[PDB]
């Protein structure tokens, strides 16, 4: 289907006097593969997946250079935006950056990204045409003015259409046996009494990959939308994910409810009920 490579940059200023901090993380689909932390001792881009570990010293040398360059720019970036917003040089702030490529079934660039945030709000973002910017306010337009003069719009399109894409394919081939394998979810159902007229039915989905999944409770062939409590999909800690869906139902009539589990690791959607 569709694959993706993503990077997540976080730039934090932090008075009183601590030097600003820069953290970077890289993902292929739902799998992290690299890490950097200006606070860590290493001072290099470290592998967080087996299939990148098998990479030359020259690779990690460049990756490290970039991280250090990002780390040196961080203070100035934070200092710049602090100026656009007339903010005091006494408070803490954050600049986040997300970029990467989506690889379509055709093997060409499906979609590209380069968007930044200031203190959790959209700041500036590359449009889908990869040729123009969208600034959130007159402050971000200060940045836009800069990136336009340097022709940053292109030269990120070039990266997204080339490197992002060739290396994504590379990672995908080397980690093929896992990255392109779908682990189907292990499922079961639990039951807890709420009161005398009601009870809770919980549908479990464990150890699945990728994270994309769909849990729904049904009665009379109908979805119990606003009665179903879907918890955010969470990491198991071993690389896979977990999720459940609960619905409050009248006691006794438990059997009129069936849970429907959908995952790309299953041939037919999974169907189960409570088994006392």
């Amino acid at each position: 289907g569709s694959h993706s490579m993503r990077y997540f940059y976080t730039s934090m200023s932090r008075p009183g006097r601590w030097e600003p901090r820069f953290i970077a993380v890289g993902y292929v689909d739902d799998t992290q593969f690299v890490r950097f932390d200006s606070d860590a001792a290493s001072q290099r881009m470290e592998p967080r997946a087996p299939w990148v570990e098998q990479e030359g010293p020259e690779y990690w040398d460049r990756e490290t250079r970039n991280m250090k360059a990002e780390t040196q720019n961080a203070p100035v970036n934070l200092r710049n935006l602090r100026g656009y917003y007339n903010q005091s040089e006494a408070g803490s702030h954050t600049i986040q950056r997300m970029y990467g490529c989506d690889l379509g079934p055709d093997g060409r660039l499906l979609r590209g990204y380069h968007q930044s945030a200031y203190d959790g709000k959209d700041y500036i973002a590359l449009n889908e045409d990869l040729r123009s910017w969208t600034a959130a306010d007159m402050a971000a337009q200060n940045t836009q003015r800069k990136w336009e003069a340097a022709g940053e719009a292109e030269q990120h399109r070039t990266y997204l259409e080339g490197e992002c894409l060739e290396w994504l394919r590379r990672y995908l081939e080397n980690g093929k046996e896992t990255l392109q394998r779908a682990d189907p979810p292990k499922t079961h159902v639990t039951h807890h009494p709420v009161s005398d007229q009601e009870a809770t039915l919980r549908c479990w989905a464990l150890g699945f990959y990728p994270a994309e999944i769909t849990l729904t409770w049904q009665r009379d062939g109908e979805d119990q939308t606003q009665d179903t409590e879907l918890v955010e999909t969470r990491p198991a800690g071993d690389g896979t994910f977990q999720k459940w869906a609960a619905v409050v139902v009248p006691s006794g009539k438990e059997q009129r409810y069936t849970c429907h589990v959908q995952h790309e690791g299953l041939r037919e959607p999974l169907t189960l009920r409570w088994e006392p």
Partner: peptide, 9 residues
């Protein structure tokens, strides 16, 4: 892999 440091904000 990674993208160059680019231009400052």
């Amino acid at each position: 892999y990674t993208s160059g440091p680019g231009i400052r904000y």
